[PDB]
Amino acid sequence: GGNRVTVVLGAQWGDEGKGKVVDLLAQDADIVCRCQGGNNAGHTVVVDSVEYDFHLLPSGIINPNVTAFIGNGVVIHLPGLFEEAEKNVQKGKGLEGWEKRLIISDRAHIVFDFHQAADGIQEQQKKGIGPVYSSKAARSGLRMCDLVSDFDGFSERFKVLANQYKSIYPTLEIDIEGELQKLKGYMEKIKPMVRDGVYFLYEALHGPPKKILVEGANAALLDIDFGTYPFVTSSNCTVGGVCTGLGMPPQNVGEVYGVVKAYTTRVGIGAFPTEQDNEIGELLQTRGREFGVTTGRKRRCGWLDLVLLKYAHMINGFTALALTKLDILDMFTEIKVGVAYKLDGEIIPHIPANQEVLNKVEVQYKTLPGWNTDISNARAFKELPVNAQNYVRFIEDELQIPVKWIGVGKSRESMIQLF
Amino acid sequence: GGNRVTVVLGAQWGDEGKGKVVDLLAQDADIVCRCQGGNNAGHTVVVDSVEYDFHLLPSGIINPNVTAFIGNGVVIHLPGLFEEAEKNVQKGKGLEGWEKRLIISDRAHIVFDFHQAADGIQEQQKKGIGPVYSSKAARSGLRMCDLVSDFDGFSERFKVLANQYKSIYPTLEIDIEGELQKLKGYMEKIKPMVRDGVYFLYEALHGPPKKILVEGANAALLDIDFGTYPFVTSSNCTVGGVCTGLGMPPQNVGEVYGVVKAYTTRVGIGAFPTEQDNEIGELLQTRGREFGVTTGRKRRCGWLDLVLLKYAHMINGFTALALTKLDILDMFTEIKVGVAYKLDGEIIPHIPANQEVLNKVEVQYKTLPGWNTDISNARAFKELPVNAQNYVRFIEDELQIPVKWIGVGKSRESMIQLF
Ligand SMILES: Nc1nc2c(ncn2[C@@H]2O[C@H](COP(=O)(O)OP(=O)(O)O)[C@@H](O)[C@H]2O)c(=O)[nH]1
Ligand SMILES: Nc1nc2c(ncn2[C@@H]2O[C@H](COP(=O)(O)OP(=O)(O)O)[C@@H](O)[C@H]2O)c(=O)[nH]1
Q1: Which residues lie closer than 8 Å to A61 by C-beta, 6 or more apart?
Q2: Backbone angles phi, psi at A392, to 5 degrees
Q3: Which among A267, A365, A351 is positioned nearest to A309, based on CA atoms?
């Protein structure tokens, strides 16, 4: 019974174009949610030329009729949150009254300045994601409910945790009193936004009809359990993280959309079976503009991998796909798709869990004919050339998951919706 | 599509009688699973007088027709696992051929001796649960797939992690070479049991009809996110942990049974709104034999709390309840049940997330008449006295969840199944 949430999840290693899909769906949502992760990825939404940037906040908050909801599974750096919101207010009127439309689950953990600093030091041996999730598991971390209740109690616990980090990282510059004093100011602005998230969501699920959207962060292959460990993030980026990060049961999960780029990218090091460190990869990188916006560094590129897609589907149970950046392939005379894995000369049915073993797999490819035409103006599936249509159908046939959206360009209008 | 798993979850703070329900359901299961947690709780299953004890292993493995499955969310101390299995083999023939009927997900994390040792030290400032889940989040932990692949690689990483703990805990006695040498022996016995768990489960879900049972560990109010934090365990003991700990989607979750004791217990310190630290609590403790079997220490006891039960249901979406130890109440002339919470003189709709605030709530009670008769021989709901029937109906009416089982004694036969 009750409303069933719509979830948008990245199917690969991020940068698939989830924001493009969320943009469309958030236009008629009532509630938009974050369930897991922190603020490590930035996205830009343009309204009347004005470029707003989101990191922790659900991009859907740009719709004036939505309530944005931060779940218990999310980790929150308070200076970062206020900086992000305040900078948006400086850019234009799009976030007018945001404080009235943001609800923060009081069970969310707080990322401290020292967690971010420790993150940098550990990397030497910087959003503080590893450290805050480690403190959470250790039960030493502090939560929003602690900050907004007895500040003496909060302060005592904060000092213990800060001193732990200081004693483990002697080179760590840690301003215990200064951080704590800024938190006093941060606590007073956040208080009205902090509430019981389990009760909030339960009431929204069981009241009148509502469209509730959950914006997944990161992607399936970056999942702490299921991704290419240890080259993963520290949270569950998969569907089960919706349930654990929002405190709602499986029967309230509705549509789960997998955002699948028409070819593959990876940002960091880590196994990448279909990687094309060559002219094919250069062509993908150039046409897909595959580089960090806040770094400039090029992403590793490769062919679509349907073996890893099927794996993400085993875990996530996608109800439909959004296949993005199909237009990148407009210049390809032939396109390869990974369809099977061999290990030591033998076909294997699984994804090797160990990184070094995954590194040894030989991908078996299907070669499909290119269309060699510009599809950027296509607005319906009938307008796509046959070989582009067949590329889409091949993915549908191999995965047995229907494609609901096809991305044919950067703009909002550059999308085909099939049903 | 496919098979849908049955889940048994503790609804309160543990010791509800989950093993009693699992005993019944495991008799016709094909696959029994652990999804989260480690070996911190022991249970005894009696077959032909022989007492077998389970800690990490699913108790259902006692059925010769089952395959026991350890999911990716579980944390595994290898000496403990082999000790547990080997001791059972010493007791009798009930575990004959267990190595042929145990499958271990290769994405499960390993609990090292130094994690257990650190656990003890941290408590001074001991199953190693906190430490292993902290290493998992930090991405420094090692997994079953690492152990069974390149042992040189495994050894290198093991030494880094061991040395981290040694440098943080100077008083920690850590035998790096000795642990590693025992792991060489442990690796060779475990190798045939270790496989890709995502693929294993996916095939079992989508092949012929199968009865797949998931034995939850711990309980809802001990959940890392949802429990009385920090007085919780370090894993998700709630329904979302089935999905994250087994790598299967919400559409493959079927029946989710909440095991609810007819009154409440807590083992450790932590908020306990209906606690009866008095003659009522003593009577519950005595009749329910509420003490640790491996410690002898008495559990804190209190009235049934329907406010916290409704909260666990918001998160878990129970499809039915098993109401255990109803016979304990046979001696009570009146029984109180917590039905609402007041905070600072005002009724509140939520469960305070902060422990100290939860400590301040005043429970509002409903008083129900006792039956004052021995129900231990009852085998059908019609055989229960009216006031016992009405106690059951009150819970059903308040929670709007049907009761499927009523426990009226310790034995297998001391159960009523309503549907
Ligand atoms: N050419 C092209 N660019 C796209 C398409 N979809 C997304 N993009 C661009 O790719 C980048 C990444 O998309 P975004 O929505 O931010 O990805 P996210 O990090 O997964 O949310 C953005 O610059 C988008 O404008 C597409 O279908 N075609
Ligand atoms: N008198 C009585 N004892 C019960 C009942 N259900 C369980 N027990 C006992 O309570 C203890 C805890 O039950 P167990 O199944 O091990 O709990 P678990 O830790 O939640 O799995 C065991 O000694 C059981 O025999 C009941 O309905 N009545």
Answers
A1: A32, A54, A68, A95, A98, A101, A102
A2: -60, -45
A3: A351
A338 forms beta bridges with A305, A365
Cα–Cα distance list, A33 to A128, A196, A316, A334 (Å): 21, 14, 18, 40
Task: Tell me the CA end-to-end span of chain B in Å, nearest whole number.
Answer: 25
Domain of A277: which CATH number?
Answer: 3.90.170.10
Same domain, A225 and A285: no
Note whether A218 and A306 are same-domain residues. no
Domain identity same for B357 and B217:
no
CB B36 within 8 A of CB B241: yes
For residues B341 and A103, give the distance between their C-alpha atoms in angstroms, rounded to a whole number.
23
> Which of A225, A357, A399 has the most B C-beta neighbours within 10 Å, making it the best mutation to test the interface with B?
A225
- Are A378 and A244 found together in one domain? no
- Report the relative pairing of strands B320-324 and B253-261 from DSSP bridges: parallel
- Return d(Cα A89, Cα A285) in angstroms, integer: 34
- Enter the tokens of residue A182: 């800024």
Which CATH number do you get for residue B250? 3.40.440.10
- Chain A: residue nearest B237 by CA? A244
User: Which residue, A227, A259, A291, sits at the end of a domain?
Assistant: A259
Specify the CATH number for the domain of residue B181: 1.10.300.10
The number of residues making up chain B comes to 419
- Annotated resolution, angstroms: 1.9
Residue linked to tokens 């009405």: B390
A313 is in an annotated binding site: no
B80 and B228 assigned to the same domain: yes
CB-based burial label for B127 (10 Å; 0-12, 13-18, 19+): buried
Summarize chain A as % helix, strand, coil (round to 5): 40, 25, 35
Using the structure block, give the residue that is written with the tokens 């004959």.
B96
Of the three residues A147, A176, A193, the one that is the final residue of a domain is: A193
B202 contacts in A (CB within 8 Å)? 314
B281-304 residues labelled b (16+ CB within 10 A) or e (exposed): bebbbebbebeeeeeeebbbbbbb
Total domains in chain A come to 3
Query: Rounded to whole angstroms, how far apart are CA atoms A412 and A245?
Result: 29
Q: Which ligand is nearest to the CA of B414?
A: 2
Domain with B226, as residue range(s), is: 3-105+194-259
- In this complex, the residue of B199, B243, B247 whose CB is nearest that of residue A349 is B199
**Cα–Cα distance for residue pair B94/B26, rounded to 1 Å:** 15
The token pair that represents A419 in the structure block: 């049903």
Q: Are strands A31-34 and B403-407 parallel, antiparallel or unpaired?
A: unpaired
- Helix, strand and coil percent figures for chain B, each rounded to 5: 40, 25, 35
* Neighbour-count burial of B75, counting CB atoms closer than 10 A to its CB (0-12 exposed, 13-18 middle, 19+ buried): buried
Same domain assignment for residues B272 and B330: yes
Looking at the structure, tell me whether residues B201 and B143 fall in a common domain.
no
- Kindly give the residue spans of alpha helices, DSSP state H, lying in A235-317: 240-246, 279-287, 306-316
A258 touches chain B (CB under 8 A): no
Task: Locate the DSSP E strands across A278-361.
Answer: 300-302, 304-305, 320-324, 334-343, 346-348
Tokens of B57: 């292993």
B407 assigned binding-site residue: yes
Experimental method reported for this structure: X-ray
Spatial distance between the Cα atoms of B290 and B272, rounded to a whole number of angstroms:
16
Q: Which helix (H) or strand (E) holds A257?
A: strand A253-261
Do residues B287 and B371 share a domain? yes
Q: Which two tokens stand for residue A85?
A: 């919101």
